[PDB]
Scaffold this active site. Structure first.
Site, PDB file in Angstrom:
ATOM      1  N   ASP C   4      35.953  40.740  47.200  1.00  0.00           N
ATOM      2  CA  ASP C   4      36.995  40.927  46.174  1.00  0.00           C
ATOM      3  C   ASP C   4      37.137  39.769  45.168  1.00  0.00           C
ATOM      4  OD1 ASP C   4      38.155  43.664  46.677  1.00  0.00           O
ATOM      5  OD2 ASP C   4      39.052  42.764  48.478  1.00  0.00           O
ATOM      6  N   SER C   5      36.066  39.016  44.920  1.00  0.00           N
ATOM      7  CA  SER C   5      36.110  38.032  43.852  1.00  0.00           C
ATOM      8  C   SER C   5      35.175  38.577  42.777  1.00  0.00           C
ATOM      9  CB  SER C   5      35.800  36.606  44.318  1.00  0.00           C
ATOM     10  OG  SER C   5      34.539  36.393  44.930  1.00  0.00           O
TER      11      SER C   5
END
Ligand SMILES: [Zn+2]
Ligand SMILES: [Zn+2]
Ligand SMILES: [Zn+2]
Lengths: 46, 266, 134, 114, 65
Positions: C4-5
């Site tokens: 999730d980056s």
């Protein structure tokens, strides 16, 4: 010409002293804005 | 003639379509990189704001001034303030442009790329002129004003590269492609039924002979022949984005030899 | 760009992608303690035993307010005020330590009571960085 | 706020040299050059040209972490060939290949009428 | 706010192309698809730049000072 305060409604320059009534001389509007420095602010164009 | 060759397909003020052959992919790619990344341009870098009555924030305007294209033909005649000898800036290392606009009209008053005024001395070199490309000859629309809306500011345009800020980008997107018929098997086409029908043909499919089913896979094969298209922003003419690209990359490699020599003194 | 980056185009960030404005408004009032005894908006100074702030008072005008153009930082005093005791005592408003920007708009009015009322707004531009959420 | 200066990408620091040539211990006739304020543009290009040298036994490069524009280039050569010379030559070869490309793009543009 | 100078993705100047885009729509009675293309906004990164822009400055200007 001396530049301390601006009116918010009529937008007339006002230049006032401490204890001289926080109202505008034209429309008696009680909402005033401070000048803006005569100092030149610089910004990096990024 | 000698070594890696070029064959120009199409040319304009803003685009060069060409076929670079007898080159190694790494070289074609490094040239691609350099063109975006390291060719110097002139761009507004300091904005001293005298007066602003605009609906727009001091720095919002300051940032747009950065992105405005400025003439960078004779950008070699200009010095990097970094290595110039003056306290801050001078005529050898910078172009000073003034912008003064006031809403005289009852209608909306516009502020443009054309409204910038060179105040510095250009020492007779083609530099700092805001690039105008539109029909009407106005350039970029910096911002809009009402009535009492005023905008007085001073600009210091300096030499720079895109690795510092993308504002010093002399080129927009560079088109890059090789092996339109995937003969090198450098990609593995995703499909549902037929990879051929599903994946559109390249324009450059014309400029290369298909492989034919009967023929086996050529493992010996190497990628040379790169179809490219360099698009200039306007600061430097397209040809010079390619040439200065070649030169910048050359000077870069050169610096390594020179560095290797100073090392072999001690 | 794992777990999730995400990776962001630095070139695009410069060209102005997801760059935002940020404003904060600070406020004050000249309070009227009892009768005649009133707080005063002024740039104070080292006089007898006034508990003055550590920040720079030099950015204030004689009205105890910063001019709209000025760039502020750290614990810089943006509103100067004094409270009398029975000489003076400090009651000045410093910019949020954890913050910095440029004085945006300074508003000088009167509260319903008839006393001086002030609102100071400070503008900062926040450019997308490595820890920023999207 | 914790953001390094943008020019730190290409301008050498206090006592930073472009090249740092250290010898590789693991293998004979091998070296490790640390290029400072450089990126893939120069790395991949040099690495590739080095591979064209028959006398070059090993050539690879790595940008160990993106936050820092620097790369390590490991060169191993056959006996009696200094990897330094291998790089010296690889560079000359690149310049000469580019010069050819300049004088030929110039040739083609000076043939175009737009 | 106001038409960005240049495309975020590729950096092609879209700063000039605003007023001209709007005239192609209004006066020329063209559709956005052909309008963008006439102005020579070729890749979709550049198209989204002008096509999807909201010129709020026009609303802000409507307020007094
Ligand atoms: Zn008034
Ligand atoms: Zn100078
Ligand atoms: Zn684009």
């Amino acid at each position: 010409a001396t530049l301390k305060y601006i009116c918010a409604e009529c937008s007339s320059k006002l230049s006032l002293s401490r204890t001289d009534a926080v109202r505008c001389k034209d429309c008696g509007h009680r909402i005033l804005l401070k000048a803006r420095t005569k100092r030149l602010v610089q910004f990096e164009a990024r | 003639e000698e070594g890696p060759q070029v064959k120009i397909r199409e040319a304009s003020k803003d685009n060069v379509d060409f076929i670079l052959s007898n080159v190694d992919l790494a070289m074609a790619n490094s040239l691609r990189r350099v063109m975006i990344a390291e060719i110097p341009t002139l761009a507004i870098d300091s904005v001293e704001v005298e007066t602003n009555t605009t609906v727009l924030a001091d720095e919002f305007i300051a940032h747009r001034l950065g992105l405005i294209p400025l003439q960078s033909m004779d950008i070699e005649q200009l010095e990097y303030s970094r290595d110039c000898f003056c306290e801050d800036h001078c005529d050898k290392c910078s172009v000073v442009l003034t912008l003064q606009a006031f809403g005289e009209s009852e209608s909306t008053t516009n502020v443009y790329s054309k409204d910038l005024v060179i105040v510095s001395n250009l020492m007779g070199r083609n530099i700092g002129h805001p690039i105008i490309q539109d029909k009407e000859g106005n350039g970029v629309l910096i911002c809009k004003l009402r009535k009492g809306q005023e905008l007085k500011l001073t600009c210091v345009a300096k030499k720079g590269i895109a690795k510092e800020h993308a504002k010093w980008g002399p080129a927009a997107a560079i088109e890059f492609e090789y092996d339109p018929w995937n003969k090198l098997k450098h990609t593995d086409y995703w499909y549902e039924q037929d990879s051929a029908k599903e994946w559109p043909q390249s324009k450059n499919c014309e400029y290369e002979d298909p492989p034919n089913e009967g023929d086996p896979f050529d493992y010996k094969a190497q990628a040379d022949t790169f179809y490219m298209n360099v698009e200039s922003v306007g600061s430097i003419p397209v040809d010079q984005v390619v040439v200065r690209g070649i030169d910048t990359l050359q000077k870069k490699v050169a610096s390594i030899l020179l560095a290797l020599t100073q090392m072999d003194q001690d | 760009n794992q777990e999730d980056s995400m990776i962001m185009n630095q070139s695009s960030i410069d060209r102005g992608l997801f760059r935002s404005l940020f404003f904060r408004s600070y406020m004050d009032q000249e309070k009227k303690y009892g009768m005649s005894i009133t707080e005063t908006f002024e740039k104070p100074q080292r006089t007898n035993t006034l508990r003055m702030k550590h920040g720079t008072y030099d950015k204030l005008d004689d009205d105890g307010l910063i001019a709209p153009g000025v760039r502020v930082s750290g614990e810089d005093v943006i509103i100067g005020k004094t409270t009398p005791i029975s000489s003076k005592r400090d009651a000045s408003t410093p910019l949020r330590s954890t913050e910095n920007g440029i004085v945006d708009q300074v508003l000088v009015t009167t509260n319903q009571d008839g006393l001086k009322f002030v609102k100071v707004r400070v503008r900062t531009t926040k450019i997308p960085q490595i820890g920023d959420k999207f | 706020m914790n953001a390094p200066d943008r020019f730190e990408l290409f301008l050498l620091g206090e006592g930073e040299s472009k090249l740092k040539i250290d010898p590789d211990t693991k293998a004979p006739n091998a070296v490790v050059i640390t290029f400072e304020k450089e990126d893939h543009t120069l790395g991949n290009l040099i690495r590739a040209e080095l591979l064209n040298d028959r006398k070059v036994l090993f050539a690879a490069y790595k940008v160990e972490h993106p936050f820092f524009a620097r790369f390590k280039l490991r060169i191993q050569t056959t006996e009696g060939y200094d990897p330094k010379d291998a790089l010296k030559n690889a560079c000359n070869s690149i310049i000469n290949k580019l010069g050819a490309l300049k004088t030929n793009f110039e040739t083609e543009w000076n043939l175009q009428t737009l | 706010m106001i038409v960005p100078v240049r495309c975020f993705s590729c950096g092609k100047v879209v700063g000039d192309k605003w007023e001209s885009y709007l005239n192609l729509l209004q006066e020329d009675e063209l559709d956005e698809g052909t309008a963008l293309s006439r102005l020579g906004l070729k890749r979709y990164c550049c198209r989204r730049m002008i096509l999807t822009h909201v010129d709020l400055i026009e609303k802000f200007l409507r307020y007094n000072p």
